[PDB]
Amino acid sequence: QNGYERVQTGELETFRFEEARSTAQSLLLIGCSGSGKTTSLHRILATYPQVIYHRELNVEQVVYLKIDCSHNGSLKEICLNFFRALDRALGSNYERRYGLKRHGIETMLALMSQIANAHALGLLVIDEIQHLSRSRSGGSQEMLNFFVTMVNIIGVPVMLIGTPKAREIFEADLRSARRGAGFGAIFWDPIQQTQRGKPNQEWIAFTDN
Amino acid sequence: GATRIQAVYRDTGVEAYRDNPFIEALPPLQESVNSAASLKSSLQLTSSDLQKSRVIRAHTICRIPDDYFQPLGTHLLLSERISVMIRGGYVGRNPKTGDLQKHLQNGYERVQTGELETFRFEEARSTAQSLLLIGCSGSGKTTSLHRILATYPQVIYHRELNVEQVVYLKIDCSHNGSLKEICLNFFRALDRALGSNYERRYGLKRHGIETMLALMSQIANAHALGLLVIDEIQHLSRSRSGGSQEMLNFFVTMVNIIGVPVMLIGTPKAREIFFGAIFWDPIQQTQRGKPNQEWIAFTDNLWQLQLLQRKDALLSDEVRDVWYELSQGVMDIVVKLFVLAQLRALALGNERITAGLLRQVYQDELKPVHPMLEALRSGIPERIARYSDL
Amino acid sequence: QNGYERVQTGELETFRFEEARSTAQSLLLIGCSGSGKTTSLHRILATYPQVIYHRELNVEQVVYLKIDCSHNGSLKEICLNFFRALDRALGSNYERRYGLKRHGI
Amino acid sequence: MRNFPVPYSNELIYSTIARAGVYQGIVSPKQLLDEVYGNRKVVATLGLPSHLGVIARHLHQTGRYAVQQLIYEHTLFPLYAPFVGKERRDEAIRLMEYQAQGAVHLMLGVAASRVKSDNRFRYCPDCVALQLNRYGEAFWQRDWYLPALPYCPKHGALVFFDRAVDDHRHQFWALGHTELLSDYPKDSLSQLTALAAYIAPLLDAPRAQELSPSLEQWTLFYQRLAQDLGLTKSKHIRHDLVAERVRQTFSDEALEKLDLKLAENKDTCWLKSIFRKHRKAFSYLQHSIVWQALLPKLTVIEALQQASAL
DNA sequence: CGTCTGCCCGCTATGAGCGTTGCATTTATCAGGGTTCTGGTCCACAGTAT
DNA sequence: ATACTGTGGACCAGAACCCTGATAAATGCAACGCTCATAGCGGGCAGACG
Ligand SMILES: Nc1ncnc2c1ncn2[C@@H]1O[C@H](COP(=O)(O)OP(=O)(O)OP(=O)(O)O)[C@@H](O)[C@H]1O
Ligand SMILES: Nc1ncnc2c1ncn2[C@@H]1O[C@H](COP(=O)(O)OP(=O)(O)OP(=O)(O)O)[C@@H](O)[C@H]1O
Ligand SMILES: Nc1ncnc2c1ncn2[C@@H]1O[C@H](COP(=O)(O)OP(=O)(O)O)[C@@H](O)[C@H]1O
Ligand SMILES: [Mg+2]
Ligand SMILES: [Mg+2]
Ligand SMILES: [Mg+2]
Ligand SMILES: [Zn+2]
């Protein structure tokens, strides 16, 4: 209010009011099956306590969350694993209240944004993203937009784990490839026995131990 | 949700902007000096935070994409046009001399009869205009609309009346061309900027599509909404049966009859469905046979944010050329590539940015966006037609 | 055929065919209690066999019917006594077919 | 409710609530009662409403509107306050805040007369045109809704029409100009218009709040006044000169229309009971007729000053 | 000239959105009593004619 | 100086809105069926092989 009055009386030439946070950081990890795309995540995120309780506030900060995609390729079954996986980390129930059938996909996408900042959730990991290709629920452009909308709403960083078959889903247009490779795209390869003209020092250290 | 700024009325210098509480309480119209200095931002880069550890110097360097903004030539025109169409949309909606009470009285019939052309007064006109923004992905359509519309206070409160004027509102389109989920995003974005319950009483009562198209535009006049922004209008291409045209007829009845200004944003794939239009393009290195002044300024202002100990103040022409070659003009790619190269340099330990390092970072960590950049690089229209959004 | 559009429109005077005509008479019997109105009526009506089944047609001619007004006098318990008394003489389920559905008067 | 209209100048709060319903497209009356009030068991009343206090809380951010201001300036309270007394007036003001419609009506005289006198909506042809010209809307006004006179103070007659308050007891209705008027000639009695113009300034007068003479004050004031006119026998009334004066001032058709037809033969009468000791507070209209028939050189506020002094 | 390999394509299953439906809740309706308001009443008080 | 009459005041009850109770009818909402878009399977039918 002081800034507003000063700029209105001409004393202060310009002033900046409240701003809105931009799009959430997104990462895409793509590696052939059997390389350890789930064991690595469960051994890296295990050093972070999941649910932290704050005394001066009243928020149970859920540091991370790991959900998995559906085999149908459905889009109301990946907005509902969110509630079913927030129920196994906390104690309260959410699929009973927010998991009805009257609510559409967009409404289920705008109620997983209030309980995404009510608890200061830190990461959202979606596993096996390859299952969404060729689903009977909707076309190929009803989900390439669903990811864009979901990234643009929730605001928590999103991590996607998938198979090199799922690269073709995200290399379809510049919007989805820009958002999917938001903070770099990590690609995993099998260990090679030798690099250049010398034996590798990773295979030997992985075998001799 | 949003901070309510108590209004104080200035003295406008325009005859038409005479006694409106709505446009005599907005911040003063800035000038060309303030069109290029009220948007600039940069990282602090304190010299005390360059000798720190690698982890601190690598966490404080990832804030460059969020906190860096450099206004180009196009932002001046965009700011002027938005200013004109947000200040001129209230003169036909005067609340003093009984002009807004003639726009709210008509809108009750449209809620009752369900037809959006049942005027009760014929002396209440509309004075709003329309804009259309189209540009390649990563050009800056949103992050240069959240810093040009951020000099206005949003929710203002006028105590001479009881009105709570909402200066601007932003919504985005549904993931399909849905019908009842564009009139629900309006309520979900209006009741989290006022702390009210509009979605729980407009829509939960089992209304039709016509009643939810009339109630939305009535509650958008109960609060003197100044500008309505819809992001990603290309989501209407995959609409339901008839949705691709009913909503585009509504978006031309709202600005023409009801009088609320509307602005639309979309990728060039949204030109098929079609409003004064503004087209944005990636920065071109050569304008008139010489390097672009805007591009030179952008590069030389980005280069002054470097946490590498062995940094080079002088920017090489070869380095600039290969940066443009690997970026192909999109500002998002430019900034992201700079940040990724800086992080990889810190990781390796060699703390000087090289053309080879730039190429390695590109080839290793920009795999998904490769074909679009290569299509823009080739410049063949046949290759451009598929993807690259140009 | 005329009676179907009375059901559809809801007005009991919308007759479609002009050639159709009504040939009926009305009567009321009033007497002090103990005169013997009910049993006299039953003795008179016992001569007709009620449900006569025609063979060349398929109609079951109900010669007569008897109902009594409800104690409440309600508008819904006098149009249901007719259905309750039309299947106690035929063996059908007219009440379950018509009464149970949500219908106005 | 996030945006409650400020009442216009000289308006009934019923019209303010109806316009609040109009401005947001709340067609359903139950939804309107839920949003504005919170309970579905309220009665839409014109003149002496209740539940103010949740209306004055919607306007709380506007500094200039408090409960007393709505009670006095936007409800028909100033037409009962000077006559009922002091304790009844204070109790009624205390009860307008809370949720009791019955008690507020019981405390006041004709509010307890349990009849809604001419409950149909009224309007004035010429006033609506002025309101459309100046404000741009059309609202109910305190001038039209006089307790007993079906007449605008300045213009001729109030053009009635169908519908009423009690047809739907939970709905607020706001006038629309599409029913502006119907052109049919109507003429008004001169003395009745004079009475309306005499009683109108009592509405817009700050001094009517604190000038409420008590019952013994009323009877002593009328006794000394009647003695000063000289028509008073020893502890008796002439019962002829007063009737002659009031018949000269107001004609028989008027007294039929306002429902105070004289019965000089009958010992009990509205005019006869005033001379005797007052038992209960009489309506404003009876006092208005007495004042205008006896002495026309003093206004309503001057009469209140003289009554309150001694 | 028949067939047996690709191409049609008829058909089964599935999910999201919309329209439909029956139960519990709310709303409305009517009878009975009551308690203070009032409507008129009778009696005492006072002013007066024989 | 003493009986007759007009009038104000204390005063019986009639009654009318409010409260309570039971009974019948009108919605809101949670649950269920209808419709359309989409992907795929395998059997039957037009061109090439013998
Ligand atoms: N003029 C600019 N100067 C500096 N950075 C910019 C500029 N324009 C855009 N950016 C950067 O680009 C990033 C992403 O771009 P932005 O979010 O504006 O894209 P967009 O137009 O919304 O894209 P999409 O096509 O996906 O809708 C921003 O976070 C910002 O850092
Ligand atoms: N004509 C008659 N001859 C012989 N017995 C008769 C005659 N009329 C009446 N009764 C006798 O009187 C009684 C008639 O009872 P019923 O209930 O029919 O009479 P009601 O008073 O007309 O009836 P409702 O209850 O319908 O008014 C029977 O006991 C019957 O035997
Ligand atoms: N870095 C590693 N060192 C040792 N074992 C590993 C490593 N990465 C993966 N594995 C082994 O691979 C097995 C399968 O990994 P898994 O979690 O299934 O990965 P994915 O889901 O990608 O196949 C695990 O049982 C684990 O023991
Ligand atoms: Mg796995
Ligand atoms: Mg955007
Ligand atoms: Mg009988
Ligand atoms: Zn008037």
PDB file of N, CA and C in Angstrom, chain A residues 1 4 7-8 13-18 20 22 104-107 110 141-142 145-146 148-149 152 167 172-175 177-178 181-185 187, chain B residues 3 5-8 10 25-28 33-34 38 62 136-138 147 150-151 174-175 181 188 232 234-235 238 332 336 364-365 367-369 372 388-389:
ATOM      1  N   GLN A   1       0.821  -1.204   0.000  1.00  0.00           N
ATOM      2  CA  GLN A   1       0.000   0.000   0.000  1.00  0.00           C
ATOM      3  C   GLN A   1       0.859   1.260   0.000  1.00  0.00           C
ATOM      4  N   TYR A   4       2.005   1.727  -3.494  1.00  0.00           N
ATOM      5  CA  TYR A   4       0.914   2.212  -4.334  1.00  0.00           C
ATOM      6  C   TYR A   4       0.695   3.707  -4.145  1.00  0.00           C
ATOM      7  N   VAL A   7       3.630   5.705  -5.711  1.00  0.00           N
ATOM      8  CA  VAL A   7       3.606   5.784  -7.169  1.00  0.00           C
ATOM      9  C   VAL A   7       2.411   6.602  -7.652  1.00  0.00           C
ATOM     10  N   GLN A   8       1.328   6.663  -6.872  1.00  0.00           N
ATOM     11  CA  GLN A   8       0.173   7.448  -7.292  1.00  0.00           C
ATOM     12  C   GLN A   8       0.363   8.942  -7.058  1.00  0.00           C
ATOM     13  N   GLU A  13       8.604   6.537  -9.237  1.00  0.00           N
ATOM     14  CA  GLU A  13       8.281   6.519 -10.659  1.00  0.00           C
ATOM     15  C   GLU A  13       7.657   5.192 -11.083  1.00  0.00           C
ATOM     16  N   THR A  14       8.158   4.074 -10.557  1.00  0.00           N
ATOM     17  CA  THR A  14       7.643   2.758 -10.908  1.00  0.00           C
ATOM     18  C   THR A  14       7.645   1.853  -9.685  1.00  0.00           C
ATOM     19  N   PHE A  15       6.784   0.837  -9.715  1.00  0.00           N
ATOM     20  CA  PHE A  15       6.679  -0.111  -8.617  1.00  0.00           C
ATOM     21  C   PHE A  15       6.177  -1.439  -9.159  1.00  0.00           C
ATOM     22  N   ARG A  16       6.613  -2.526  -8.523  1.00  0.00           N
ATOM     23  CA  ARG A  16       6.275  -3.882  -8.942  1.00  0.00           C
ATOM     24  C   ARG A  16       5.453  -4.549  -7.851  1.00  0.00           C
ATOM     25  N   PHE A  17       4.257  -5.002  -8.208  1.00  0.00           N
ATOM     26  CA  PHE A  17       3.361  -5.655  -7.267  1.00  0.00           C
ATOM     27  C   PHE A  17       3.639  -7.157  -7.266  1.00  0.00           C
ATOM     28  N   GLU A  18       2.725  -7.939  -6.696  1.00  0.00           N
ATOM     29  CA  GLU A  18       2.924  -9.379  -6.585  1.00  0.00           C
ATOM     30  C   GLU A  18       3.012 -10.024  -7.962  1.00  0.00           C
ATOM     31  N   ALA A  20       3.450 -13.940 -10.234  1.00  0.00           N
ATOM     32  CA  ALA A  20       3.027 -15.332 -10.240  1.00  0.00           C
ATOM     33  C   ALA A  20       4.189 -16.231 -10.637  1.00  0.00           C
ATOM     34  N   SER A  22       6.371 -19.108 -12.260  1.00  0.00           N
ATOM     35  CA  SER A  22       6.352 -19.665 -13.606  1.00  0.00           C
ATOM     36  C   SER A  22       6.258 -21.191 -13.539  1.00  0.00           C
ATOM     37  N   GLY A 104     -14.706 -34.433 -13.315  1.00  0.00           N
ATOM     38  CA  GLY A 104     -14.024 -34.751 -14.548  1.00  0.00           C
ATOM     39  C   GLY A 104     -12.525 -34.814 -14.348  1.00  0.00           C
ATOM     40  N   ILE A 105     -11.817 -35.005 -15.460  1.00  0.00           N
ATOM     41  CA  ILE A 105     -10.361 -35.051 -15.404  1.00  0.00           C
ATOM     42  C   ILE A 105      -9.797 -33.686 -15.033  1.00  0.00           C
ATOM     43  N   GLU A 106     -10.372 -32.610 -15.574  1.00  0.00           N
ATOM     44  CA  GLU A 106      -9.892 -31.274 -15.237  1.00  0.00           C
ATOM     45  C   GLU A 106     -10.161 -30.927 -13.775  1.00  0.00           C
ATOM     46  N   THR A 107     -11.334 -31.289 -13.259  1.00  0.00           N
ATOM     47  CA  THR A 107     -11.617 -31.030 -11.854  1.00  0.00           C
ATOM     48  C   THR A 107     -10.739 -31.884 -10.947  1.00  0.00           C
ATOM     49  N   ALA A 110      -7.550 -30.062 -10.793  1.00  0.00           N
ATOM     50  CA  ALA A 110      -7.546 -28.827 -10.021  1.00  0.00           C
ATOM     51  C   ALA A 110      -7.832 -29.041  -8.542  1.00  0.00           C
ATOM     52  N   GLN A 141      -3.627 -36.567 -28.950  1.00  0.00           N
ATOM     53  CA  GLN A 141      -3.548 -35.153 -28.616  1.00  0.00           C
ATOM     54  C   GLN A 141      -4.408 -34.777 -27.420  1.00  0.00           C
ATOM     55  N   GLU A 142      -5.044 -35.743 -26.769  1.00  0.00           N
ATOM     56  CA  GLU A 142      -5.767 -35.491 -25.532  1.00  0.00           C
ATOM     57  C   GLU A 142      -4.919 -35.751 -24.297  1.00  0.00           C
ATOM     58  N   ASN A 145      -1.592 -32.740 -24.462  1.00  0.00           N
ATOM     59  CA  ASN A 145      -2.053 -31.523 -23.812  1.00  0.00           C
ATOM     60  C   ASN A 145      -2.272 -31.712 -22.320  1.00  0.00           C
ATOM     61  N   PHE A 146      -2.607 -32.930 -21.889  1.00  0.00           N
ATOM     62  CA  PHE A 146      -2.833 -33.167 -20.469  1.00  0.00           C
ATOM     63  C   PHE A 146      -1.556 -32.969 -19.668  1.00  0.00           C
ATOM     64  N   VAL A 148       0.911 -30.950 -20.537  1.00  0.00           N
ATOM     65  CA  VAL A 148       1.201 -29.521 -20.535  1.00  0.00           C
ATOM     66  C   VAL A 148       0.361 -28.814 -19.479  1.00  0.00           C
ATOM     67  N   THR A 149      -0.932 -29.134 -19.428  1.00  0.00           N
ATOM     68  CA  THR A 149      -1.813 -28.529 -18.434  1.00  0.00           C
ATOM     69  C   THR A 149      -1.412 -28.921 -17.015  1.00  0.00           C
ATOM     70  N   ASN A 152       1.632 -27.114 -15.991  1.00  0.00           N
ATOM     71  CA  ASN A 152       1.344 -25.699 -15.825  1.00  0.00           C
ATOM     72  C   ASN A 152       0.490 -25.382 -14.604  1.00  0.00           C
ATOM     73  N   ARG A 167      10.127 -42.371 -25.627  1.00  0.00           N
ATOM     74  CA  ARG A 167      10.716 -41.178 -26.226  1.00  0.00           C
ATOM     75  C   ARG A 167       9.854 -40.659 -27.367  1.00  0.00           C
ATOM     76  N   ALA A 172       7.230 -35.340 -30.191  1.00  0.00           N
ATOM     77  CA  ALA A 172       6.176 -35.118 -31.171  1.00  0.00           C
ATOM     78  C   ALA A 172       6.003 -33.663 -31.566  1.00  0.00           C
ATOM     79  N   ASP A 173       6.269 -32.730 -30.657  1.00  0.00           N
ATOM     80  CA  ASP A 173       6.145 -31.306 -30.936  1.00  0.00           C
ATOM     81  C   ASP A 173       7.009 -30.527 -29.953  1.00  0.00           C
ATOM     82  N   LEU A 174       7.275 -29.260 -30.291  1.00  0.00           N
ATOM     83  CA  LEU A 174       8.248 -28.487 -29.520  1.00  0.00           C
ATOM     84  C   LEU A 174       7.751 -28.167 -28.116  1.00  0.00           C
ATOM     85  N   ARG A 175       6.436 -28.059 -27.920  1.00  0.00           N
ATOM     86  CA  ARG A 175       5.912 -27.786 -26.586  1.00  0.00           C
ATOM     87  C   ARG A 175       6.246 -28.918 -25.621  1.00  0.00           C
ATOM     88  N   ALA A 177       8.384 -31.451 -25.961  1.00  0.00           N
ATOM     89  CA  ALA A 177       9.813 -31.698 -25.811  1.00  0.00           C
ATOM     90  C   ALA A 177      10.493 -30.599 -25.007  1.00  0.00           C
ATOM     91  N   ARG A 178       9.994 -29.366 -25.097  1.00  0.00           N
ATOM     92  CA  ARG A 178      10.516 -28.289 -24.264  1.00  0.00           C
ATOM     93  C   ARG A 178      10.195 -28.524 -22.796  1.00  0.00           C
ATOM     94  N   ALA A 181      11.983 -32.023 -21.393  1.00  0.00           N
ATOM     95  CA  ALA A 181      13.397 -31.757 -21.144  1.00  0.00           C
ATOM     96  C   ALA A 181      13.583 -30.405 -20.464  1.00  0.00           C
ATOM     97  N   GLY A 182      12.832 -30.187 -19.382  1.00  0.00           N
ATOM     98  CA  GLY A 182      12.843 -28.885 -18.737  1.00  0.00           C
ATOM     99  C   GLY A 182      14.127 -28.603 -17.985  1.00  0.00           C
ATOM    100  N   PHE A 183      14.669 -29.611 -17.313  1.00  0.00           N
ATOM    101  CA  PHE A 183      15.898 -29.479 -16.544  1.00  0.00           C
ATOM    102  C   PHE A 183      16.913 -30.516 -17.002  1.00  0.00           C
ATOM    103  N   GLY A 184      16.993 -30.715 -18.307  1.00  0.00           N
ATOM    104  CA  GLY A 184      17.843 -31.739 -18.885  1.00  0.00           C
ATOM    105  C   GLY A 184      17.117 -33.058 -19.046  1.00  0.00           C
ATOM    106  N   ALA A 185      17.569 -33.839 -20.020  1.00  0.00           N
ATOM    107  CA  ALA A 185      17.070 -35.190 -20.237  1.00  0.00           C
ATOM    108  C   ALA A 185      18.220 -36.159 -20.011  1.00  0.00           C
ATOM    109  N   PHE A 187      19.795 -39.861 -20.164  1.00  0.00           N
ATOM    110  CA  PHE A 187      19.687 -41.105 -20.910  1.00  0.00           C
ATOM    111  C   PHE A 187      20.724 -42.089 -20.392  1.00  0.00           C
TER     112      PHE A 187
ATOM    113  N   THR B   3      -3.746  -9.581  -2.536  1.00  0.00           N
ATOM    114  CA  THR B   3      -3.731  -8.468  -1.597  1.00  0.00           C
ATOM    115  C   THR B   3      -4.633  -7.343  -2.094  1.00  0.00           C
ATOM    116  N   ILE B   5      -5.664  -3.735  -2.396  1.00  0.00           N
ATOM    117  CA  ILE B   5      -5.033  -2.425  -2.332  1.00  0.00           C
ATOM    118  C   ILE B   5      -6.132  -1.375  -2.272  1.00  0.00           C
ATOM    119  N   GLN B   6      -6.136  -0.570  -1.213  1.00  0.00           N
ATOM    120  CA  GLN B   6      -7.097   0.519  -1.114  1.00  0.00           C
ATOM    121  C   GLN B   6      -6.804   1.572  -2.176  1.00  0.00           C
ATOM    122  N   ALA B   7      -7.858   2.066  -2.819  1.00  0.00           N
ATOM    123  CA  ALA B   7      -7.711   2.935  -3.978  1.00  0.00           C
ATOM    124  C   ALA B   7      -7.521   4.388  -3.570  1.00  0.00           C
ATOM    125  N   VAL B   8      -6.661   5.089  -4.307  1.00  0.00           N
ATOM    126  CA  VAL B   8      -6.529   6.539  -4.230  1.00  0.00           C
ATOM    127  C   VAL B   8      -6.566   7.084  -5.652  1.00  0.00           C
ATOM    128  N   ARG B  10      -6.059   9.561  -8.773  1.00  0.00           N
ATOM    129  CA  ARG B  10      -5.150  10.552  -9.329  1.00  0.00           C
ATOM    130  C   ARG B  10      -5.917  11.486 -10.263  1.00  0.00           C
ATOM    131  N   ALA B  25      -8.031   5.261 -10.837  1.00  0.00           N
ATOM    132  CA  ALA B  25      -7.352   4.634  -9.714  1.00  0.00           C
ATOM    133  C   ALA B  25      -6.279   3.644 -10.138  1.00  0.00           C
ATOM    134  N   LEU B  26      -6.134   3.380 -11.432  1.00  0.00           N
ATOM    135  CA  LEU B  26      -5.059   2.541 -11.923  1.00  0.00           C
ATOM    136  C   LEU B  26      -3.731   3.286 -11.828  1.00  0.00           C
ATOM    137  N   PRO B  27      -2.612   2.562 -11.783  1.00  0.00           N
ATOM    138  CA  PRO B  27      -1.316   3.228 -11.756  1.00  0.00           C
ATOM    139  C   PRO B  27      -1.122   4.073 -12.999  1.00  0.00           C
ATOM    140  N   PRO B  28      -0.366   5.167 -12.894  1.00  0.00           N
ATOM    141  CA  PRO B  28      -0.262   6.102 -14.019  1.00  0.00           C
ATOM    142  C   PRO B  28       0.372   5.457 -15.239  1.00  0.00           C
ATOM    143  N   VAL B  33      10.711   5.683 -21.094  1.00  0.00           N
ATOM    144  CA  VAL B  33      11.779   5.451 -20.129  1.00  0.00           C
ATOM    145  C   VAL B  33      11.389   4.340 -19.158  1.00  0.00           C
ATOM    146  N   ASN B  34      10.108   4.265 -18.798  1.00  0.00           N
ATOM    147  CA  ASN B  34       9.612   3.249 -17.880  1.00  0.00           C
ATOM    148  C   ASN B  34       9.057   2.020 -18.586  1.00  0.00           C
ATOM    149  N   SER B  38      11.086  -0.806 -16.031  1.00  0.00           N
ATOM    150  CA  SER B  38      10.211  -1.448 -15.063  1.00  0.00           C
ATOM    151  C   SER B  38      10.061  -2.942 -15.313  1.00  0.00           C
ATOM    152  N   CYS B  62      21.554 -21.856 -10.584  1.00  0.00           N
ATOM    153  CA  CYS B  62      20.363 -22.362 -11.249  1.00  0.00           C
ATOM    154  C   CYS B  62      19.184 -21.405 -11.158  1.00  0.00           C
ATOM    155  N   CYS B 136       6.283 -18.792 -31.606  1.00  0.00           N
ATOM    156  CA  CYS B 136       6.907 -20.094 -31.415  1.00  0.00           C
ATOM    157  C   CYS B 136       7.043 -20.416 -29.933  1.00  0.00           C
ATOM    158  N   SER B 137       7.029 -21.708 -29.619  1.00  0.00           N
ATOM    159  CA  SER B 137       7.142 -22.133 -28.231  1.00  0.00           C
ATOM    160  C   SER B 137       8.517 -21.782 -27.678  1.00  0.00           C
ATOM    161  N   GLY B 138       8.533 -21.248 -26.460  1.00  0.00           N
ATOM    162  CA  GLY B 138       9.745 -20.737 -25.864  1.00  0.00           C
ATOM    163  C   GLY B 138      10.055 -19.295 -26.189  1.00  0.00           C
ATOM    164  N   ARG B 147       5.077 -10.151 -16.344  1.00  0.00           N
ATOM    165  CA  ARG B 147       5.865  -9.001 -15.932  1.00  0.00           C
ATOM    166  C   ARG B 147       5.387  -7.700 -16.552  1.00  0.00           C
ATOM    167  N   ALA B 150       2.084  -7.243 -14.282  1.00  0.00           N
ATOM    168  CA  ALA B 150       2.422  -7.303 -12.867  1.00  0.00           C
ATOM    169  C   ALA B 150       2.651  -5.928 -12.264  1.00  0.00           C
ATOM    170  N   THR B 151       2.473  -4.865 -13.040  1.00  0.00           N
ATOM    171  CA  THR B 151       2.514  -3.513 -12.509  1.00  0.00           C
ATOM    172  C   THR B 151       1.136  -3.004 -12.109  1.00  0.00           C
ATOM    173  N   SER B 174      -9.066 -25.869 -21.406  1.00  0.00           N
ATOM    174  CA  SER B 174      -9.111 -27.261 -20.983  1.00  0.00           C
ATOM    175  C   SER B 174      -8.267 -28.135 -21.908  1.00  0.00           C
ATOM    176  N   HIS B 175      -7.892 -29.320 -21.409  1.00  0.00           N
ATOM    177  CA  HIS B 175      -6.972 -30.173 -22.160  1.00  0.00           C
ATOM    178  C   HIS B 175      -7.609 -30.705 -23.437  1.00  0.00           C
ATOM    179  N   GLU B 181     -15.851 -26.916 -18.764  1.00  0.00           N
ATOM    180  CA  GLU B 181     -14.594 -26.782 -18.044  1.00  0.00           C
ATOM    181  C   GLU B 181     -13.801 -25.557 -18.471  1.00  0.00           C
ATOM    182  N   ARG B 188     -12.831 -21.110 -10.795  1.00  0.00           N
ATOM    183  CA  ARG B 188     -11.729 -21.579  -9.961  1.00  0.00           C
ATOM    184  C   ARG B 188     -10.578 -20.587  -9.895  1.00  0.00           C
ATOM    185  N   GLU B 232      -3.168 -20.818 -24.076  1.00  0.00           N
ATOM    186  CA  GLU B 232      -3.230 -22.043 -24.872  1.00  0.00           C
ATOM    187  C   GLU B 232      -4.620 -22.228 -25.490  1.00  0.00           C
ATOM    188  N   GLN B 234      -5.005 -23.038 -28.463  1.00  0.00           N
ATOM    189  CA  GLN B 234      -4.875 -24.153 -29.391  1.00  0.00           C
ATOM    190  C   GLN B 234      -5.503 -25.436 -28.872  1.00  0.00           C
ATOM    191  N   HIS B 235      -5.872 -25.488 -27.596  1.00  0.00           N
ATOM    192  CA  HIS B 235      -6.530 -26.659 -27.040  1.00  0.00           C
ATOM    193  C   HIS B 235      -7.952 -26.835 -27.551  1.00  0.00           C
ATOM    194  N   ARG B 238      -8.847 -29.782 -30.806  1.00  0.00           N
ATOM    195  CA  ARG B 238      -9.392 -31.106 -30.503  1.00  0.00           C
ATOM    196  C   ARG B 238     -10.665 -31.002 -29.673  1.00  0.00           C
ATOM    197  N   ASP B 332      14.348 -19.465 -24.574  1.00  0.00           N
ATOM    198  CA  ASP B 332      14.376 -20.535 -23.585  1.00  0.00           C
ATOM    199  C   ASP B 332      15.572 -21.447 -23.803  1.00  0.00           C
ATOM    200  N   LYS B 336      18.642 -21.838 -21.125  1.00  0.00           N
ATOM    201  CA  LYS B 336      18.836 -23.181 -20.596  1.00  0.00           C
ATOM    202  C   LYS B 336      20.198 -23.732 -20.983  1.00  0.00           C
ATOM    203  N   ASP B 364      24.622 -33.888 -25.548  1.00  0.00           N
ATOM    204  CA  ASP B 364      24.355 -34.855 -24.493  1.00  0.00           C
ATOM    205  C   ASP B 364      23.053 -34.597 -23.748  1.00  0.00           C
ATOM    206  N   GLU B 365      22.602 -33.340 -23.640  1.00  0.00           N
ATOM    207  CA  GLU B 365      21.468 -33.041 -22.774  1.00  0.00           C
ATOM    208  C   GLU B 365      20.373 -32.239 -23.468  1.00  0.00           C
ATOM    209  N   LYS B 367      18.519 -33.890 -26.175  1.00  0.00           N
ATOM    210  CA  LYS B 367      18.073 -34.899 -27.133  1.00  0.00           C
ATOM    211  C   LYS B 367      16.639 -34.703 -27.617  1.00  0.00           C
ATOM    212  N   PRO B 368      15.631 -34.490 -26.760  1.00  0.00           N
ATOM    213  CA  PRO B 368      14.255 -34.414 -27.284  1.00  0.00           C
ATOM    214  C   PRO B 368      14.008 -33.260 -28.242  1.00  0.00           C
ATOM    215  N   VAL B 369      14.673 -32.119 -28.065  1.00  0.00           N
ATOM    216  CA  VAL B 369      14.381 -30.938 -28.870  1.00  0.00           C
ATOM    217  C   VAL B 369      15.290 -30.884 -30.089  1.00  0.00           C
ATOM    218  N   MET B 372      13.491 -30.455 -33.949  1.00  0.00           N
ATOM    219  CA  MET B 372      12.911 -29.136 -34.190  1.00  0.00           C
ATOM    220  C   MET B 372      13.990 -28.086 -34.434  1.00  0.00           C
ATOM    221  N   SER B 388       8.582 -28.002 -34.907  1.00  0.00           N
ATOM    222  CA  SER B 388       9.374 -26.777 -34.770  1.00  0.00           C
ATOM    223  C   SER B 388       8.501 -25.532 -34.628  1.00  0.00           C
ATOM    224  N   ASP B 389       7.190 -25.683 -34.836  1.00  0.00           N
ATOM    225  CA  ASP B 389       6.187 -24.654 -34.536  1.00  0.00           C
ATOM    226  C   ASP B 389       6.564 -23.284 -35.095  1.00  0.00           C
TER     227      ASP B 389
END
